[PDB]
Coordinates of C-alpha atoms in Angstrom, one line a residue:
Chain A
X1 CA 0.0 0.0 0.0
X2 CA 1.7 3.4 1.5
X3 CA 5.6 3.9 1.7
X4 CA 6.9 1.8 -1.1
X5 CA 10.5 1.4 -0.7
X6 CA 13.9 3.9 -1.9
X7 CA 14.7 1.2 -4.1
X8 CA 11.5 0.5 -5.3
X9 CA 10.7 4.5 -6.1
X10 CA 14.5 4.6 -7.6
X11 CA 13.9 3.0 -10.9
X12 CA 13.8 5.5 -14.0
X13 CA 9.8 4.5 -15.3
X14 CA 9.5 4.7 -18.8
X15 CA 12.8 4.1 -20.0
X16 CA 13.0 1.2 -22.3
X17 CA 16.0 -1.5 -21.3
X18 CA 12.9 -4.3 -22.1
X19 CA 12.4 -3.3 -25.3
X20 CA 16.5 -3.6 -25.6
X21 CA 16.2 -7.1 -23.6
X22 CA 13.1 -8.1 -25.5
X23 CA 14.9 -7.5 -28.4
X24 CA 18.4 -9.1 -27.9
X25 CA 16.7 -12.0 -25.9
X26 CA 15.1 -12.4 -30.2
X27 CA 17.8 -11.1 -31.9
X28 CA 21.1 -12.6 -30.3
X29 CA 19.5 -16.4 -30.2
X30 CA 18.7 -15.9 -34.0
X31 CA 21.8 -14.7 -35.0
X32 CA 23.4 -17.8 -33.5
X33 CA 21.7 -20.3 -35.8
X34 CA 23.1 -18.0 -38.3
X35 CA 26.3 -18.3 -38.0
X36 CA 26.4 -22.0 -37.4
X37 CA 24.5 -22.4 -40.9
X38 CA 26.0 -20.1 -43.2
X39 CA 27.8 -20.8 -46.2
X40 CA 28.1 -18.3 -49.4
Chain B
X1 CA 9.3 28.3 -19.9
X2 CA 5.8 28.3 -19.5
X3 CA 6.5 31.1 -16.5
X4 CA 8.6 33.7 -19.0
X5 CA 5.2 33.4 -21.2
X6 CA 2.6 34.0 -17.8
X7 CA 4.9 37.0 -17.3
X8 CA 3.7 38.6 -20.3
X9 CA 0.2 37.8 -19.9
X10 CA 0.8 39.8 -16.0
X11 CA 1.5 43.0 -18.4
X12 CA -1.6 42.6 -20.2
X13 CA -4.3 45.9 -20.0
X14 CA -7.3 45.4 -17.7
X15 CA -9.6 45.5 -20.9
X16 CA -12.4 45.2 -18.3
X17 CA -12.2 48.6 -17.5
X18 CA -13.8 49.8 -20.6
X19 CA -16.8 47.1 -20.1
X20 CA -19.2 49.8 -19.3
X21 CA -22.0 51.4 -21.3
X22 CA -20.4 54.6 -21.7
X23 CA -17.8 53.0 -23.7
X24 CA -20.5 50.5 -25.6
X25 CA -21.9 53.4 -27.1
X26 CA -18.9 56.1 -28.1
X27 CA -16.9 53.5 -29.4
X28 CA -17.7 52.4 -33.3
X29 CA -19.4 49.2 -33.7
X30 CA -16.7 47.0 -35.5
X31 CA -13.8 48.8 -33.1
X32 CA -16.5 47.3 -30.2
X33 CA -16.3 43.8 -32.1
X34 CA -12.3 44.0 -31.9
X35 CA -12.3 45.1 -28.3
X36 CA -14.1 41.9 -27.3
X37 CA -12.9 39.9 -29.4
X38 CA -9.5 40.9 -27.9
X39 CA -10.7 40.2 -24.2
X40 CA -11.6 36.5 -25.6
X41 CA -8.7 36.3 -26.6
X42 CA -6.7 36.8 -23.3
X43 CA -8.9 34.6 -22.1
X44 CA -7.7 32.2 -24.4
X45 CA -4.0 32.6 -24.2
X46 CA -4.2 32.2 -20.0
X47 CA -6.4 29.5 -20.0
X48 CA -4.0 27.4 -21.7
X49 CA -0.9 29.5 -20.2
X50 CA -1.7 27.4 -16.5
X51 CA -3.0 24.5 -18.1
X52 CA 0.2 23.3 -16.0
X53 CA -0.9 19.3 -16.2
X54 CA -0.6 19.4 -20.2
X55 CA 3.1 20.0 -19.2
X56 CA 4.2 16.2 -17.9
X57 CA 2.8 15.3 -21.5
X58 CA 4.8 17.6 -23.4
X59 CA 8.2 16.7 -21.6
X60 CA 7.5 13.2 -23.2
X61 CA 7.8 14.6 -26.8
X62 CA 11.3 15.2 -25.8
X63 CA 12.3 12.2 -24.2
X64 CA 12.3 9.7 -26.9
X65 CA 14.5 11.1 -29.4
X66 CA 16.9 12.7 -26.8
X67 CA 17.3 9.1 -25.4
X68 CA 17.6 7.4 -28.7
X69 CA 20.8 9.9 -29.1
X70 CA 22.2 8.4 -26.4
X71 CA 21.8 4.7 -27.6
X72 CA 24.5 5.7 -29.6
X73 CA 26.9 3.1 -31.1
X74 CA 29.9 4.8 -30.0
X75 CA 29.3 6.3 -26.8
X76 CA 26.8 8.5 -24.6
X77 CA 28.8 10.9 -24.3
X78 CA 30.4 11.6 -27.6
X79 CA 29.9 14.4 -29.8
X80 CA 30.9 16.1 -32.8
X81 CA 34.0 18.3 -31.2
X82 CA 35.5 15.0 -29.4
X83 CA 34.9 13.1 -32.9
X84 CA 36.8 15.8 -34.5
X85 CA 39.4 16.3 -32.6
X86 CA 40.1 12.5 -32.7
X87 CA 40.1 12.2 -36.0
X88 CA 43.2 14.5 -36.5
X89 CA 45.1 12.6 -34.0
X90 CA 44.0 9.0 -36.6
X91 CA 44.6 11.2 -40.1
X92 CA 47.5 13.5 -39.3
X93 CA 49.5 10.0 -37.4
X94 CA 50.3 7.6 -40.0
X95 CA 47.8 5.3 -41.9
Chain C
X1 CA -1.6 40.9 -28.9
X2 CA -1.2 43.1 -25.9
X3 CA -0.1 46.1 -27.6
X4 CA -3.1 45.2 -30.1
X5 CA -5.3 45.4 -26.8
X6 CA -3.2 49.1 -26.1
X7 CA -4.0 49.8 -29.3
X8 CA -7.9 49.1 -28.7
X9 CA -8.0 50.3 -25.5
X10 CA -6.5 53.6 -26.5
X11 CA -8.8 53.8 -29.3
X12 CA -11.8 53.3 -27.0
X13 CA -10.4 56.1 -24.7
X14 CA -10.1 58.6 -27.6
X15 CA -14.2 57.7 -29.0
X16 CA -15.3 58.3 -25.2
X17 CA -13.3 61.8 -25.0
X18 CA -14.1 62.7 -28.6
X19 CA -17.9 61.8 -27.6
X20 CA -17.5 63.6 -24.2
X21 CA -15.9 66.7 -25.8
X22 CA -19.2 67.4 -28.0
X23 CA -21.2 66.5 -25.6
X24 CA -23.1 64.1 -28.0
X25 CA -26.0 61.9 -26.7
X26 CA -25.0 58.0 -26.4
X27 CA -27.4 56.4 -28.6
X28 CA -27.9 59.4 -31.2
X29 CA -24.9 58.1 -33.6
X30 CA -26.0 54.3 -33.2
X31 CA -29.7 55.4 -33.8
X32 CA -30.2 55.3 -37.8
X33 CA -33.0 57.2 -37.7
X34 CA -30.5 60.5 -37.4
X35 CA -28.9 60.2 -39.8
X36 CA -32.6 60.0 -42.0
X37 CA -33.6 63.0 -43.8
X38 CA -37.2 63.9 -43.5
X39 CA -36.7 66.8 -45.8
X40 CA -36.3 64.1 -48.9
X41 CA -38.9 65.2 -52.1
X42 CA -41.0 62.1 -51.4
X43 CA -41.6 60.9 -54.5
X44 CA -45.8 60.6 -55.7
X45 CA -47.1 57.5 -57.1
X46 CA -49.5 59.2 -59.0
X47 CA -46.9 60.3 -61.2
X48 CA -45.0 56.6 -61.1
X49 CA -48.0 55.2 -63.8
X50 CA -48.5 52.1 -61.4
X51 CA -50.8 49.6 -61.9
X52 CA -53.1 47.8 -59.7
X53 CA -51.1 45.9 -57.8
X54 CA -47.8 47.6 -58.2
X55 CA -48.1 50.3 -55.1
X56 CA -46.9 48.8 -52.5
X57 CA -43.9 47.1 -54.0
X58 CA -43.2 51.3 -55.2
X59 CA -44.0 52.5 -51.5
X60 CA -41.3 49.4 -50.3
X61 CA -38.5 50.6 -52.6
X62 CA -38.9 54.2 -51.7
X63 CA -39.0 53.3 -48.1
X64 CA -36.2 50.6 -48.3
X65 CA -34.1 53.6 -50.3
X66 CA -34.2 56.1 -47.9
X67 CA -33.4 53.4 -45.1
X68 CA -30.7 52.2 -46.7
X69 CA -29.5 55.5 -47.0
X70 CA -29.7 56.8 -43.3
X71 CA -27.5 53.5 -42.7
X72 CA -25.2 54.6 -44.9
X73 CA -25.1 57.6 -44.0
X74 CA -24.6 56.2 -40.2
X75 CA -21.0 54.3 -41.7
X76 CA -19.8 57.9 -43.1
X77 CA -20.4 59.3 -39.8
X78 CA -18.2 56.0 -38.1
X79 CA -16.3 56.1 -40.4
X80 CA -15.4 59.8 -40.0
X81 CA -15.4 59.1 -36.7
X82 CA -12.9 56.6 -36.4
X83 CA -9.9 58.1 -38.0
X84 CA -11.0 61.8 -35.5
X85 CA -10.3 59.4 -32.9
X86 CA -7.6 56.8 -34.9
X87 CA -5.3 60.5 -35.3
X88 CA -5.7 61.0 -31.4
X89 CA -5.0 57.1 -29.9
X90 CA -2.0 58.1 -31.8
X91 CA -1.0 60.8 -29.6
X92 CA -2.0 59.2 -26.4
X93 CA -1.5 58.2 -22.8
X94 CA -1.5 54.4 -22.4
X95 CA -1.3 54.3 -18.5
X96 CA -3.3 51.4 -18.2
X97 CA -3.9 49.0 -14.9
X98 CA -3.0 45.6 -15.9
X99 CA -4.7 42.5 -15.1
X100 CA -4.9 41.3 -11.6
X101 CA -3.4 37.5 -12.3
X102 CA -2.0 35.8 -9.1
X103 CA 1.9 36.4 -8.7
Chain D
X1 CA 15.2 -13.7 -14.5
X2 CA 18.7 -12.4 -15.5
X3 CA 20.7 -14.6 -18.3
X4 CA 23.8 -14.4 -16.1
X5 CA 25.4 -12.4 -18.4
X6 CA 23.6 -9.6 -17.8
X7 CA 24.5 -10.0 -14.2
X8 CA 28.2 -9.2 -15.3
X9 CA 27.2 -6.5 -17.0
X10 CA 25.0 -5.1 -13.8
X11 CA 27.8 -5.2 -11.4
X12 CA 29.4 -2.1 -12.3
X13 CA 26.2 -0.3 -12.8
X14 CA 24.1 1.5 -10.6
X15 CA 20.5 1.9 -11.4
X16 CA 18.0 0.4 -9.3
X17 CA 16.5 -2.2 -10.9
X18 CA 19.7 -3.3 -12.4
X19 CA 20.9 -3.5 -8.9
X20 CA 18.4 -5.3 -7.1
X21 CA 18.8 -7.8 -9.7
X22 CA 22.2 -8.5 -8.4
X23 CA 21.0 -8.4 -5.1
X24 CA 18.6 -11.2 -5.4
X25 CA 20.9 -13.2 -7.4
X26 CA 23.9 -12.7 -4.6
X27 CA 21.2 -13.5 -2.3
X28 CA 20.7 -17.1 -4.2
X29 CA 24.3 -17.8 -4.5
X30 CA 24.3 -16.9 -0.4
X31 CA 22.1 -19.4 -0.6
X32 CA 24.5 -22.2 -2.2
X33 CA 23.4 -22.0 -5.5
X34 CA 26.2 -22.6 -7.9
X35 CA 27.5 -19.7 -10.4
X36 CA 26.7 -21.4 -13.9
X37 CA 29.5 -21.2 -16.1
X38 CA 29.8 -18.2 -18.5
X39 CA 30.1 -18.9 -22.2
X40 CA 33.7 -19.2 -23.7
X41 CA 32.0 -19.2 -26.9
X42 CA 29.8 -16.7 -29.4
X43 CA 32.6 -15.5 -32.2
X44 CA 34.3 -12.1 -33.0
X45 CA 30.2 -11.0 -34.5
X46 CA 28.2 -12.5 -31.8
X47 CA 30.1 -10.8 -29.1
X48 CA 30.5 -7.3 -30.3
X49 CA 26.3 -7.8 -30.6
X50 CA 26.0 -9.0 -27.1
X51 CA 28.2 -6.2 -25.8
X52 CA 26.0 -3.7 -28.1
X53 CA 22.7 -4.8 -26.3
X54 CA 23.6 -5.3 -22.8
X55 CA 25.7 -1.8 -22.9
X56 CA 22.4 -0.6 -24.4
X57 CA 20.4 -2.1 -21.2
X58 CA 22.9 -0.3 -18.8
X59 CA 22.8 3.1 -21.0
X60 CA 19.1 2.9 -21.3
X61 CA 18.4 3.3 -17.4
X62 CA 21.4 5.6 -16.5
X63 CA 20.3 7.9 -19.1
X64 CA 16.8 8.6 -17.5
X65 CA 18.2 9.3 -14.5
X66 CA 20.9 12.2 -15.2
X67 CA 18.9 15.2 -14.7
X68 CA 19.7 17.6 -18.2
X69 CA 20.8 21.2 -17.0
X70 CA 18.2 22.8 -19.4
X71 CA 18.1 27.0 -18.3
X72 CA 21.1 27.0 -16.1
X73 CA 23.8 29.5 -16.1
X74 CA 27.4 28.4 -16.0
X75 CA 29.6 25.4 -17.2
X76 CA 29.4 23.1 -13.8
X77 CA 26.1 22.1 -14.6
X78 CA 27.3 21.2 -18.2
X79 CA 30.3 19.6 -16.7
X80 CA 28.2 17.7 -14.1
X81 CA 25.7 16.3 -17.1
X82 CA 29.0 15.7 -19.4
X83 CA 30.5 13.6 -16.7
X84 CA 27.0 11.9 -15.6
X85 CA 27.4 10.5 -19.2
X86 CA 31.1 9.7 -18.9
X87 CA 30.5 7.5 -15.8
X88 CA 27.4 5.8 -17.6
X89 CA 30.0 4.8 -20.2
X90 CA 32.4 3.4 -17.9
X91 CA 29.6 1.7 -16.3
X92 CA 28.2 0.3 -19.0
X93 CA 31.0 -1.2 -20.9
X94 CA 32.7 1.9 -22.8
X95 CA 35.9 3.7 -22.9
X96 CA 36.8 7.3 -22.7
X97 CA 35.3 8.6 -26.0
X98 CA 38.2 9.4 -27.6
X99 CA 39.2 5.8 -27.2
X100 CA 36.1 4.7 -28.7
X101 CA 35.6 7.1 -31.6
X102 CA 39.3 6.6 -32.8
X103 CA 38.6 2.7 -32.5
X104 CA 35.6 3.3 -34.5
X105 CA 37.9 4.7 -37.5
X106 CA 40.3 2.5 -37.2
X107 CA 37.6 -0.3 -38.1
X108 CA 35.7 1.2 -40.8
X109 CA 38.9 1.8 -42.5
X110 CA 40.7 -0.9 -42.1
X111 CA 41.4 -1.7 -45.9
X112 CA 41.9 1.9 -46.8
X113 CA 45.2 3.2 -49.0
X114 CA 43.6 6.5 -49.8
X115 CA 42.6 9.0 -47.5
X116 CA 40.0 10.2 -49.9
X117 CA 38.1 6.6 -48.9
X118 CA 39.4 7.6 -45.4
X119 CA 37.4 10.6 -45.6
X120 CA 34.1 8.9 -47.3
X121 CA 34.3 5.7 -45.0
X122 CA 34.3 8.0 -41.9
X123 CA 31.8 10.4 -42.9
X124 CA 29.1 9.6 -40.6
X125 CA 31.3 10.5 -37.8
X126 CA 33.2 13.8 -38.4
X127 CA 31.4 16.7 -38.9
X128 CA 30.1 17.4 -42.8
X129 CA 31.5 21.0 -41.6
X130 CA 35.1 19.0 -41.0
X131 CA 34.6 16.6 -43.7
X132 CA 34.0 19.7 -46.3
X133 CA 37.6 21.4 -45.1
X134 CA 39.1 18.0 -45.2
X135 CA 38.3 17.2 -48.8
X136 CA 38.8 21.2 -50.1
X137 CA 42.4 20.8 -48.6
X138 CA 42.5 17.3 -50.2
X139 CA 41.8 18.6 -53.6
X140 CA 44.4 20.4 -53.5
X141 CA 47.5 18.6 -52.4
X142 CA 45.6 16.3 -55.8
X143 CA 46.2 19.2 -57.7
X144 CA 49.9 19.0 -56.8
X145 CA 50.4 15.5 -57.2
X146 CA 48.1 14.8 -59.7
X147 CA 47.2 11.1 -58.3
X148 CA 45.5 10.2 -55.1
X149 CA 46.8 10.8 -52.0
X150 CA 47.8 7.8 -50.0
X151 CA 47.2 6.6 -47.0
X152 CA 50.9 5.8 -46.3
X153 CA 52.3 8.3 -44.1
X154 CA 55.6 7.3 -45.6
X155 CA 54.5 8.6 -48.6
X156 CA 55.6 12.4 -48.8
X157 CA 52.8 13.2 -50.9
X158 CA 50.6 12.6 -48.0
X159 CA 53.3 14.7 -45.5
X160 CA 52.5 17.4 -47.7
X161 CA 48.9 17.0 -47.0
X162 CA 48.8 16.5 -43.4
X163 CA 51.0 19.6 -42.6
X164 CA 47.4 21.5 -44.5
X165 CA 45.1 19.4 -42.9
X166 CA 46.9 20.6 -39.5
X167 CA 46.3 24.0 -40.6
X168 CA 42.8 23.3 -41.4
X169 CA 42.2 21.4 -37.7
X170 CA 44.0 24.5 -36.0
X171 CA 41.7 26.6 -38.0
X172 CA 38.3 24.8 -36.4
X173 CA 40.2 25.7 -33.0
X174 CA 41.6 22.4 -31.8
X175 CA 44.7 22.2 -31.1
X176 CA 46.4 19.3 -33.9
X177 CA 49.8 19.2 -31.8
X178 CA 48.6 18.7 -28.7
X179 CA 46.1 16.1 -29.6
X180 CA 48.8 13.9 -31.5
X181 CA 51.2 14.9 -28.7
X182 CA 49.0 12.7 -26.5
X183 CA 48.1 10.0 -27.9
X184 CA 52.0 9.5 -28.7
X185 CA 53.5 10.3 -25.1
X186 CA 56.5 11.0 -24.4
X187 CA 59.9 9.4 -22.7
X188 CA 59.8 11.5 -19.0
X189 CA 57.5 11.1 -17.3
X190 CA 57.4 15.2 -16.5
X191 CA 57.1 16.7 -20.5
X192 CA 54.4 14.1 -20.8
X193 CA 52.5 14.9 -17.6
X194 CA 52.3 18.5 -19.1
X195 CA 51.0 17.4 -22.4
X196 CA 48.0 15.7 -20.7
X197 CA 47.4 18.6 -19.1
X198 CA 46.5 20.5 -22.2
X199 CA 44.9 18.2 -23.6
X200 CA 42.5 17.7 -20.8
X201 CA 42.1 21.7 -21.1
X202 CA 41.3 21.2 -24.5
X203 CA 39.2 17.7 -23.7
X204 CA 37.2 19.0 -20.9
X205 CA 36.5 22.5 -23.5
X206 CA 35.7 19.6 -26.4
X207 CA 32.8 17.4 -24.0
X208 CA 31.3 20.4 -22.7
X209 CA 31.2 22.0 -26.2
X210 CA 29.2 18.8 -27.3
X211 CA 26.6 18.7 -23.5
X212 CA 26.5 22.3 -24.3
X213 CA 25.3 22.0 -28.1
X214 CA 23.1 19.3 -26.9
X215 CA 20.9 20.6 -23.8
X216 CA 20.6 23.7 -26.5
X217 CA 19.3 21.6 -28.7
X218 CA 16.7 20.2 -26.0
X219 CA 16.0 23.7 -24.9
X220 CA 15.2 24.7 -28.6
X221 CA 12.8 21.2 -28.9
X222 CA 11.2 22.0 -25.9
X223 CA 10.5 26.0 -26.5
X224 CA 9.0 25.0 -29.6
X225 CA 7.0 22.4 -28.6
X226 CA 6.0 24.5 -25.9
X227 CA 5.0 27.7 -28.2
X228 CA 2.9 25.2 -30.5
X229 CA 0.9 24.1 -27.7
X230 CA 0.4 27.4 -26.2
X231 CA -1.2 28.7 -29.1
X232 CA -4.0 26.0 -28.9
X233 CA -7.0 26.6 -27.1
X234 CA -6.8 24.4 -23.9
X235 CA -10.3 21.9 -24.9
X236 CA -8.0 21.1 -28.0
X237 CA -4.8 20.4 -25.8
X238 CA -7.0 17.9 -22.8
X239 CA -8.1 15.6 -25.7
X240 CA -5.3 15.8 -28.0
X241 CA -3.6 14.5 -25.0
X242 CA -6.2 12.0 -23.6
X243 CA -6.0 10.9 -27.3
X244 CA -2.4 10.3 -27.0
X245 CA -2.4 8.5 -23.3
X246 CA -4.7 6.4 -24.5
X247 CA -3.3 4.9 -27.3
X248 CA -0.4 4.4 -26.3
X249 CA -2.1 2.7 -23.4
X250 CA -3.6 0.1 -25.6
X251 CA -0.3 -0.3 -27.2
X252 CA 0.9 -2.3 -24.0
X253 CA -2.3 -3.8 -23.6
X254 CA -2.3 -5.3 -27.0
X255 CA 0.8 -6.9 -26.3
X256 CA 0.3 -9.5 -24.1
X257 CA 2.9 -11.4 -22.3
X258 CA 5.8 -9.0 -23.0
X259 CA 8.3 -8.2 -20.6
X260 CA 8.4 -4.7 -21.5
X261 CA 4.1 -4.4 -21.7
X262 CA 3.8 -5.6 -18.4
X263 CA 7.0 -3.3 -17.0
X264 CA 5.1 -0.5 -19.2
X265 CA 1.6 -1.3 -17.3
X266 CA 3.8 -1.6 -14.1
X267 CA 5.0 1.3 -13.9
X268 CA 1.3 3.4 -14.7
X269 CA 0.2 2.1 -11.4
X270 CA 3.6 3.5 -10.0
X271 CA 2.7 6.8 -11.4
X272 CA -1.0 6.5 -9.5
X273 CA 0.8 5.5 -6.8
X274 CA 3.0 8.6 -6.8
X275 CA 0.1 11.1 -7.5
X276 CA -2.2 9.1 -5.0
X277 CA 1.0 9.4 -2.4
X278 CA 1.5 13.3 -2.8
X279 CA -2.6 13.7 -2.4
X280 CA -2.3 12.1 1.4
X281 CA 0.7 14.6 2.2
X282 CA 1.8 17.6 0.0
X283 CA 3.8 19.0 2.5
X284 CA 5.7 16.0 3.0
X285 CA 5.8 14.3 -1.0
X286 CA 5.6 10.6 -1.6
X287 CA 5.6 8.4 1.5
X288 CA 8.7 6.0 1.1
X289 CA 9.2 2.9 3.5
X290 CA 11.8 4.4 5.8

C-alpha cells in the first residue's frame, strides 16, 4: 500500500532497457543459428 | 518556460475597465467587435498559459528522441567536437 | 496581442473623449433614424404610372431607399469618426492597470 | 530472471532495478546455489552484438536518471551532465570517448590506402563542416600530385597534405599538436604529464562544447513544442492529450505477455501511486518505507 521502498521508487519509469532485452533475448539467439549455418 | 510566457500575460491591459455602457456606445461598432474579441482572446492565451498538467505530457515529446541519441553506437557521451578532434590525431598520425 | 489590446484600448479612450468633448448623446450616432432626412422630395405614385397591384412594391423601394441610406449615412459618420479618434489614440496616454493575475 | 550475463554486465552499474537484480541473485548464490559457467564461446560478431545490447540495457536506465541542466547558467552544470554520461560509459561497458571514436575509424577503414576513402568511409562520424575542409584541402594537395593521396604516411605526398590538414584542424580551434602529442606520449615522465594537461584543457572545452550543443538543442525542442501548444485553445490540448495517453495505453495492452508491456503497465500504477501518495501529504511528497 503506503511507503513503497527507496529502491523501489529509484527506478527511472518509462525508459525502455525491455524493449533492448526483449529484443536481444530475439535477436542474439537468431543470430546464433546463423552463423552455425551459413555458407556463401 | 511556461512562467517567462505568464509574465507577459501579467502585463496585459485590464480590458475590463472599458466594459461599461459609456464606452459601448462612443466607441464604433466594429472597433467594439475588436475590443471583445481581444478580451476573448486573453482569455484564451491564459487558459492554456496554467494548463500546468498538459506540461508532464509535453516533456515526453522530448524524451524519446533525446534518449535514442544516447543509444549511440559509439558512446553516450560523444559528440561532434570529441569526434573531430580525434580524428586529426587518426589522419594526421600515420595510416 | 497586448499592444493590439493598447491599441484598442486607447482607441476606445479617444471615442469616449471625442464623444465627451461634443457633448453628444450616447445612442444618437448608433440610432439610424438620425442620420434619415425627413426633408427628402418624397416621390408621388400618382406620377410613377403604377398599376393595380404595383403600389406597394413602389411605396417598399422608396422606403427601403431612404433606409438604406440613413445607414449609410450612419458608416460615413463611423467612419469619419474613427480616424478623429484613430489620429488621437495616436497621440496618447496608455497608462493602463493591468490584469490582476496571481503572482 | 537475469541470463547471467547480464548479471556481469549489472555489477558495475548503478541503477536500481539493475541492482536489485544483483541483489537477489547474490542472495541465491548466499544461498549455495552454484554460479553457472559463463560462455567461452559466441565469435568475433556475436560478441560485439552481445556487448551492443547489454551496454544498451545499462545506458538505457542511466540515461533517465541524469537530470539535463536545461536554463542554467554556467559550465558546472554542463560539466556535471558531461560527466554523468562519462561515468554511464564506464559503467556500461565503454571507454573514454576518444578511445572509442578513434577505435571506430580504425575499423571502418581498415582496408583503406587512400585518405580520400578515409574521408568517405568516416563520414558519418566527423562533422560534414570537418569533412567539407578536409576534402577542399585534399583537392588540393591532388592538384599538386596529380594522383591520389595515400594513405601511407611514408609517402611524402601525404606529408604534404597532413602539414594542411593541421592548418585546417588549428583553424576549427583544436589544437592538432597537442592532440597527437597525446596519444603519442613522451619518454619522462614530466614533459608528458604537461601534455596531458593541455589536452584535458582542450578535452574538458571539447565534452562540454558537445553537452552544451546538446541541452541547447533540448531547450530549442522544448521552446517550440512549448509555443505550439500554447497557441491551442486548452479543450484542444486535454483531448489531444487523452487521445495520445490512450493509445499508447492500448499499445501495452495489446501486447500480451511482453516483458516490456507488463513493465510498461507496471510502472502506470507507480505513477498513480506517486500522485495518489503526494494527495495524502503535499507537504511532505511521496511516502517511502523508511
Amino acid at each position: 500500500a503506503d511507503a513503497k521502498a527507496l529502491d523501489e521508487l529509484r527506478k527511472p519509469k518509462f525508459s525502455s532497457k525491455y524493449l533492448i532485452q526483449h529484443v536481444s533475448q530475439k535477436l542474439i539467439p537468431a543470430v546464433k543459428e546463423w552463423e552455425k549455418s551459413y555458407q556463401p | 518556460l511556461s512562467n517567462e510566457r505568464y509574465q507577459l500575460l501579467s502585463q496585459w491591459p485590464d480590458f475590463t475597465t472599458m466594459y461599461g455602457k459609456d464606452f459601448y456606445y462612443r466607441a464604433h461598432p466594429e472597433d467594439l467587435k475588436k475590443f471583445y474579441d481581444a478580451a476573448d482572446e486573453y482569455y484564451k492565451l491564459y487558459e492554456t498559459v496554467t494548463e500546468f498538467d498538459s506540461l508532464s505530457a509535453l516533456a515526453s515529446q522530448v524524451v524519446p528522441n533525446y534518449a535514442a541519441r544516447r543509444r549511440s553506437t559509439v558512446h553516450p557521451a560523444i559528440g561532434s567536437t570529441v569526434a573531430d578532434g580525434a580524428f586529426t590525431n587518426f589522419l594526421l598520425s600515420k595510416q | 496581442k497586448k499592444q493590439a489590446t493598447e491599441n484598442l484600448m486607447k482607441l476606445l479612450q479617444a471615442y469616449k473623449d471625442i464623444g465627451d468633448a461634443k457633448s453628444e448623446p450616447l445612442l444618437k450616432n448608433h440610432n439610424p433614424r438620425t442620420f434619415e432626412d425627413r426633408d427628402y422630395p418624397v416621390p408621388d405614385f400618382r406620377t410613377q404610372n403604377l398599376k393595380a397591384g404595383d403600389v406597394p412594391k413602389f411605396f417598399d423601394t422608396v422606403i427601403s431607399t431612404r433606409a438604406s441610406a440613413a445607414i449609410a449615412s450612419k458608416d460615413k459618420f463611423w467612419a469619419g469618426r474613427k480616424t478623429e479618434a484613430e489620429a488621437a489614440s495616436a497621440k496618447a496616454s496608455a497608462a493602463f492597470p493591468r490584469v490582476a493575475v496571481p503572482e | 530472471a537475469v541470463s547471467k550475463k547480464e548479471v556481469l554486465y549489472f555489477l558495475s552499474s548503478k541503477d536500481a532495478e539493475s541492482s536489485t537484480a544483483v541483489k537477489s541473485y547474490l542472495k541465491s548464490l548466499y544461498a549455495g546455489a552454484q554460479v553457472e559457467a559463463t560462455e567461452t564461446d559466441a565469435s568475433e560478431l556475436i560478441a560485439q552484438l552481445e556487448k551492443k545490447y547489454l551496454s544498451a540495457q545499462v545506458v538505457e536506465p542511466g540515461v533517465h536518471n541524469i537530470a539535463l541542466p536545461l536554463g542554467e547558467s554556467g559550465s558546472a552544470p554542463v560539466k556535471r551532465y558531461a560527466a554523468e554520461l562519462f561515468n554511464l560509459g564506464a559503467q556500461a561497458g565503454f571507454e573514454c570517448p576518444f578511445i572509442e571514436v578513434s577505435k571506430k575509424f580504425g575499423q571502418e577503414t581498415a582496408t583503406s590506402e587512400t585518405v580520400k576513402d578515409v574521408l568517405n568511409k568516416t563520414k558519418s562520424y566527423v562533422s560534414a563542416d570537418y569533412n567539407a575542409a578536409l576534402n577542399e584541402v585534399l583537392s588540393s594537395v591532388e592538384a599538386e600530385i596529380n594522383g591520389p593521396v595515400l594513405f601511407d604516411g611514408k609517402t611524402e605526398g601525404f606529408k604534404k597534405f597532413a602539414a594542411k590538414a593541421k592548418a585546417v584542424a588549428v583553424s576549427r580551434g583544436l589544437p592538432a599538436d597537442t592532440i597527437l602529442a597525446y596519444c603519442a606520449g613522451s619518454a619522462n615522465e614530466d614533459a608528458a604529464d604537461k601534455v596531458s594537461k593541455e589536452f584535458f584543457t582542450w578535452f574538458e572545452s571539447a565534452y562540454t562544447a558537445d553537452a552544451a550543443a546538446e541541452v541547447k538543442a533540448i531547450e530549442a525542442e522544448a521552446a517550440s513544442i512549448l509555443d505550439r501548444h500554447l497557441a491551442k485553445p486548452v479543450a484542444q490540448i486535454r483531448k489531444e492529450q487523452a487521445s495520445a495517453y490512450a493509445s499508447l495505453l492500448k499499445r501495452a495492452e495489446t501486447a500480451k505477455g511482453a516483458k516490456w508491456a507488463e513493465k510498461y503497465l507496471e510502472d502506470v500504477k507507480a505513477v498513480q501511486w506517486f500522485d495518489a501518495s503526494v494527495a495524502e501529504a503535499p507537504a511532505s511528497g511521496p511516502k517511502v518505507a523508511a
